[PDB]
Amino acid sequence: SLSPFEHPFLSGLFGDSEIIELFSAKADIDAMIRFETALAQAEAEASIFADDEAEAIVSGLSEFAADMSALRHGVAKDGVVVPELIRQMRAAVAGQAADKVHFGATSQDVIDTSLMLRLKMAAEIIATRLGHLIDTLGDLASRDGHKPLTGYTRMQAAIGITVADRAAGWIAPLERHLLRLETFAQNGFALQFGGAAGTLEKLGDNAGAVRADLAKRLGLADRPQWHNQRDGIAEFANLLSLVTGTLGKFGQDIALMAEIGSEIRLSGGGHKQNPVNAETLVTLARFNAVQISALHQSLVQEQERSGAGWMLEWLTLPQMVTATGTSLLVAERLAAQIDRLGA
């Protein structure tokens, strides 16, 4: 496979099944079933059609099963999944409430909302891991903290510090990242619902009521459509890379200390002690410091909708969040190997 993150043997190191299944094709589809189920619900709520009309759709989709073979033909002809998906969803709905699934929505609405739902789940996992790592890193500090360390400034031997002083550089920003993450989790995971041209034209002055209700049913923030406004994505991608950068600084520190060898002991048995995990921390930092540029180039999205900037997001964002989760997984592993800090 292309990415080490999913590779049959390289995921020995780079793996993260938990994060990666959020970006599985079944996970994506299931959120698009949840979008189309809630949209009918919200429209019945806001008097666009009746309730036994919405129930007809809701239990049609109940258990819907996608034909992955025809969906792939769907992105062949269309560039996009949703025409084919909707086409099958309608065939899954008895009567002529079938005509009314997807009403008022566009392909970007459902795709980006799906993305948002799963980014939300992904950030929860990341936060929990971040909290747990801060604690792990704190446990090291409370064990070895008063022990002396030789300072190193601009690649030279500096005056003596302590273990807790150097470890303040590992823990303190991770703590700030956890704060940034939880601030973002309030507003950031948003309903995408703009319709064909971003004006919700199939709903008139009922657009507001539908958007609010559909957002509530999906556990997502209500803000008006953001088809070309990719700031939120970019901002998110920045904290994903913020996390990898700090962890990479910690990895580089651990590797350096191992090469000098006098003030760290690593473990594995009860022996080569290659700081592979430490090195992999640097690699993941550098990867995400590259990928963040994709997400920023993708702020320039012309007109009402832009495939060129939107697809660059598809190419790159999932690997950024996976870089972040794997860096958390790898750092937690490196810390378990650190048996002594200090002289």
Residue ranges that bind Cl ion, judged by CB under 5 A: 153, 226, 232
Look at residues 109, 108, 129, 59 and name the one whose alpha carbon lies nearest to residue 218: 109
143, 147, 216, 296: which one contacts a second copy (CB under 8 A)?
A: 296
For position 282 contacting a second copy by CB under 8 A, the verdict is yes
Asked if 221 and 179 touch (Cβ cutoff 8 Å), the reply is: no
For position 27 contacting a second copy by CB under 8 A, the verdict is no
Q: Report the C-alpha gap between 148 and 160 in whole angstroms.
A: 7
Report the partner that residue 326 touches, choosing among a second copy, Cl ion, none (CB closer than 5 to 8 A by kind): none
Q: How far from chain centre, in Å, is Cα 155?
A: 36
Contact characters 180-209, a second copy, x per CB under 8 A: x---------------xxxx-x--------
Interface with a second copy by CB under 8 A: which range of 94-102, 136-144, 209-217, 282-290?
282-290
Give the burial class of 277: count Cβ atoms within 10 A of its Cβ; 0-12 exposed, 13-18 middle, 19 or more buried. Answer: buried
Look at residues 18, 97, 87 and name the one whose alpha carbon lies nearest to residue 50: 97
For position 304 contacting a second copy by CB under 8 A, the verdict is yes
Residue 152: enclosing H or E segment and its boundaries?
strand 148-153
Give the burial class of 150: count Cβ atoms within 10 A of its Cβ; 0-12 exposed, 13-18 middle, 19 or more buried. Answer: middle
Q: Which of residues 213-272 bind a second copy (CB under 8 A)?
A: 224, 226-231, 234-235, 238, 241-242, 244-246, 248-249, 251-253, 255-256, 258-261, 268-270, 272
Say if strands 264-265 and 340-341 run parallel, antiparallel, or are unpaired.
antiparallel
41, 114, 280, 337: which one contacts a second copy (CB under 8 A)?
A: 280
For position 114 contacting a second copy by CB under 8 A, the verdict is no
Report the partner that residue 188 touches, choosing among Cl ion, a second copy, none (CB closer than 5 to 8 A by kind): none
For position 325 contacting a second copy by CB under 8 A, the verdict is no
For position 292 contacting a second copy by CB under 8 A, the verdict is yes
Report the partner that residue 222 touches, choosing among a second copy, Cl ion, none (CB closer than 5 to 8 A by kind): none
Look at residues 224, 210, 22 and name the one whose alpha carbon lies nearest to residue 120: 22
For position 275 contacting a second copy by CB under 8 A, the verdict is yes
Report the partner that residue 325 touches, choosing among a second copy, Cl ion, none (CB closer than 5 to 8 A by kind): none
Report the partner that residue 88 touches, choosing among a second copy, Cl ion, none (CB closer than 5 to 8 A by kind): none
Report the partner that residue 136 touches, choosing among Cl ion, a second copy, none (CB closer than 5 to 8 A by kind): none
For position 8 contacting a second copy by CB under 8 A, the verdict is yes
The least CB distance from residue 35 to a second copy, in Å, is 16
For the chain, how far is it from start to end, CA to CA, in angstroms? 44
Asked if 14 and 2 touch (Cβ cutoff 8 Å), the reply is: no
- 282 sits in the region (left: phi over 0; alpha: psi -120 to 50; else beta) called alpha
Contact characters 34-73, a second copy, x per CB under 8 A: ----------------------------------x--xxx
Report the partner that residue 61 touches, choosing among a second copy, Cl ion, none (CB closer than 5 to 8 A by kind): none
- Helix 163-187 with 231-260: angle, nearest 10 deg: 160
Token pair recorded at residue 158: 């500096």
Token pair recorded at residue 274: 């290659």
